[PDB]
Amino acid sequence: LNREDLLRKQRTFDNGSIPHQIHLGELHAILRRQEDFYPFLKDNREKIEKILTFRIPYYVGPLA
DNA sequence: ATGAGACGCTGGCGATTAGCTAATCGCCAGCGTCTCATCTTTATGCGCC
Secondary structure, eight states, rough: OOTSSOOOOOOOOGGGGOHHHHHHHHHHHHHHHHHHTHHHHSSHHHHHHHHHHHOOOOTTOOOO
């Protein structure tokens, strides 16, 4: 209780510190471990990586 | 050369039967962050028609 880790759930409030890099790492690992079977995700793994990596610049604004 | 005209317990109960806002108060209110830039504006400090 004093160490604040008593029965903590998984989807909690402290996840705001989690960067996107580790999710991208786990994504690349899953893709590389599954690209040896299916051809389409082996072909479009960099597309999915682009989906996760894509961030609209602040100077662009609305994509109207 | 005769055969119509003249019409009731209700009111005062109960007792069904049916139906409706209003006055008082309490509760309780989606919120969390960051980045990035962007401009202002203020406090003080310096100049004479």
